[PDB]
Ligand binder design. Structure first.
Ligand SMILES: [Ca+2]
Ligand SMILES: [Ca+2]
Ligand SMILES: [Ca+2]
Ligand SMILES: [Ca+2]
Ligand SMILES: [Ca+2]
Ligand SMILES: [Ca+2]
Lengths: 207, 207
């Protein structure tokens, strides 16, 4: 069947006034105040507070999807005069939504490789893989694009794979044996506003 | 029973990235892509757009609660190869939540009242009622507070009922027969950041 028992909440909420999660409600509620809505479970009475009359739920402190992706709660509908149930206690999930708040990070450094001297232009040297803690299944918050600096005219980098390639063929080891190239990974598919990380890759020329 | 088939969307959203409304989903979804989620009804395919792969719904334009408070839609789950649905098309509502973006306005103004000369201090003259197009059932966005301007020491106004009253007992008609008093209604229960409107009330001293 269709899945409806859910609420969505943005993570890392910036406002002062509590964030509105939603509203649990019973189709028996005629709108007179005889029903008492109460919640329980993860974050109940701490993170999420409910208005026992209206059913409105609010988040009182910010949420982090990289820490916890969903909260499982239960909802009860009491009679305000007798505190007895008018609806079965029902599980409902609060899904916290991803935002691009995780920068790309090169976690496997120091990155060092080697390539033979006088190699052809386009020779695969090594590969670097940055990581992004955001949600890859929703939006480009974790879709990365690798690049070099504009003032780097010895090597290039594939944009989406991050494999380093030589940009010049006349690399004689005697003139200069060691190069330090910086690589940049940017999320949001490289569009402006995308977060970025960087690493220093040392590449050394062999015979 | 519990009402769950709903999504909540804040009105007057100004940002660039489309707003996330929610996600329709079938527990029959094995997560392989053989499912085609589609939307119909109010705002379907124009205001609200859906991702057929995941089911995520987005709002493509700013919403206005004072224009429309909720949108009634239908959700379908088709098979990607046969276009025969595996769940009955289910109605679901997108309720747009209120923000304090409507100023108080005196719509039955500007009218006129009377008070007998030499009346005691605190004599009820008349009542003024401002209106607020925001949601009165949620927040103080429509809870108003009436007030006078600084340096108005002839009449007062109750902050909650808005009934004007004499502030002085020495109202001699011969000395001054007519007063133009300004009344101001402010929402958010008067707290800073509350919107305001005003009207000019002519009060006249009688015998
Ligand atoms: Ca986070
Ligand atoms: Ca990111
Ligand atoms: Ca994130
Ligand atoms: Ca509006
Ligand atoms: Ca208002
Ligand atoms: Ca409003």
């Amino acid at each position: 069947g269709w899945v409806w028992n859910q609420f969505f909440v943005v993570e890392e909420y910036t406002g002062t006034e509590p964030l509105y999660v939603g509203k649990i409600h019973s189709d028996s509620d005629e709108g007179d105040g005889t029903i008492k809505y109460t919640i329980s479970g993860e974050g109940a009475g701490t993170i999420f507070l409910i208005d026992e009359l209206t059913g409105d739920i609010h988040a009182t402190e910010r949420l982090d999807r990289e820490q916890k992706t969903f909260y499982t709660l239960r909802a009860q509908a009491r009679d305000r005069a007798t505190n007895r149930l008018l609806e079965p206690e029902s599980e409902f999930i609060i899904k916290v939504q991803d935002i691009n708040d995780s920068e790309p990070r090169f976690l496997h450094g120091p990155y060092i490789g080697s390539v033979a001297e006088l190699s052809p232009t386009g020779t695969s040297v090594m590969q670097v893989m940055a990581s992004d803690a955001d949600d890859p299944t929703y939006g480009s918050s974790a879709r990365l694009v690798y690049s070099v600096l504009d003032g780097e005219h010895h090597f290039t980098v594939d944009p989406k794979t991050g494999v380093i390639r030589t940009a010049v063929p006349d690399l004689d080891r005697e003139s200069q044996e060691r190069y330090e190239v910086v690589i940049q990974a940017t999320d949001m598919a490289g569009q402006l506003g995308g977060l970025s990380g960087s690493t220093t890759v040392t590449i050394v020329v062999t015979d």
